[PDB]
Paper text:
FtsZ is an ancient, filament-forming, tubulin-like GTPase protein found in the vast majority of bacteria and archaea, where it acts as a central component of the cell division machinery (1–3). Here, using X-ray crystallography of Staphylococcus aureus FtsZ (SaFtsZ), we reveal how an FtsZ can adopt two functionally distinct conformations, open and closed. The closed form is found within several crystal forms of two nonpolymerizing SaFtsZ mutants and corresponds to many previous FtsZ structures from other organisms. We argue that FtsZ’s conformational switch is polymerization-associated, driven by the formation of the longitudinal intersubunit interfaces along the filament.
Author numbering: 12 to 201, 998, 203 to 315
């Protein structure tokens, strides 16, 4: 499948730059912004400046109606950049003028172009104020109506994973990992024919028109490795939507030749027990002999 990651506005384009710097192989990046200064510095191969008639090449100055109109007026350019995608991840920080208004338009276009469309967006820090939060909430609601599945990261959760000295840019990279892991997990599932295979049609069944989503990867080794990996896959502190209530799950377990039936069952039970629900299990298994003693559990959960 052709996977694309589209960053919309400042924070979304930040995430695209950091992900390209980190390294990401078979994924096309697209950078969309009103802010031409920031776009000029993007590392993405595909860049779309939107709304230059509206903003004269600046940002949207905290007005989401300008981000929205900018995206609508560049619809054809956005279609052309998306065309061919089977799956699109639209990432954006909600609460500003460009992302809040343009990201739901971009997502709507991607879904109308036939792409499985996942939004990964932030809510602003409480320190940014109540009206930024209210503006962001309208963006989140518009995003939810425009995507297949939505992952919301409240930026306040970053305050739960730092100490008093953690550089702000290091905290931002942690939030990127939510998107990177989801993209990488799907990429890796598509690329290999598993002993019990999952492919893009399984991703579509779990993610299409399902609302809120969780995506996680956990890795462990040694004793209780499978349970530990499964718990890590479902336990991110940054997510608005936890695993509790999932009624839809794609789960893949990858290990070396030692991967046991028993421990795969243990892993499957961890997900359903934390789900506290009757959940939609599509379960896959991959034997990767180069893994030795490590196990990797990938989880996509929906149905909330
Ligand atoms: N986690 C994270 N949040 C960001 C980042 N940049 C901006 N934000 C958040 O995104 C919101 C909108 O900022 P920005 O994307 O620059 O606005 P826009 O360009 O007008 O869409 C801000 O109010 C912050 O809450 C980033 O790199 N990481």
């Amino acid at each position: 499948a052709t996977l694309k990651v589209i960053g919309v506005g400042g924070g979304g384009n930040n995430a695209v730059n950091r992900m390209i710097d980190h390294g990401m192989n078979n994924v096309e990046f697209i950078a969309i912004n009103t802010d031409g200064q920031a776009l000029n510095l993007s590392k993405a191969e595909s860049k779309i400046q939107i709304g230059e008639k509206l903003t004269r090449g600046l940002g949207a100055g905290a007005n989401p109606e300008i981000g929205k109109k900018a995206a609508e007026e560049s619809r054809e350019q956005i279609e052309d950049a998306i065309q061919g995608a089977d799956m699109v991840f639209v990432t954006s920080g909600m609460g500003g003028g460009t992302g809040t208004g343009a990201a739901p338009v971009v997502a709507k276009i991607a879904k109308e172009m036939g792409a499985l469309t996942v939004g990964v967006v932030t809510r602003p820090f409480s320190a940014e104020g109540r009206k930024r939060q209210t503006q962001a909430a309208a963006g989140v609601e518009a995003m939810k109506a425009a995507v297949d599945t939505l992952i919301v990261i409240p930026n306040d959760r970053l305050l739960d994973i730092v100490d008093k000295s953690t550089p702000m840019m290091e905290a931002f990279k942690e939030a990127d990992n939510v998107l990177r892991q989801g993209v990488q997990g799907i990429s890796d599932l598509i690329a290999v024919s598993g002993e019990v295979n999952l492919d893009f049609a399984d991703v579509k069944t779990i993610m299409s028109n399902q609302g809120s989503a969780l995506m996680g990867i956990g890795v462990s080794s040694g004793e209780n490795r499978a349970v530990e990996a499964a718990k890590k896959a479902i336990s991110s502190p940054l997510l608005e939507t936890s695993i509790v209530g999932a009624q839809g799950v794609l789960m893949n377990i990858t290990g070396g030749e030692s991967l046991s039936l028993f421990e795969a069952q243990e892993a499957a039970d961890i997900v359903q027990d934390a789900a506290d629900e009757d959940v939609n299990m599509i379960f896959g298994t991959v034997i990767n002999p180069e893994l030795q003693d490590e196990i990797v559990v990938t989880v996509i959960a929906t149905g909330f």
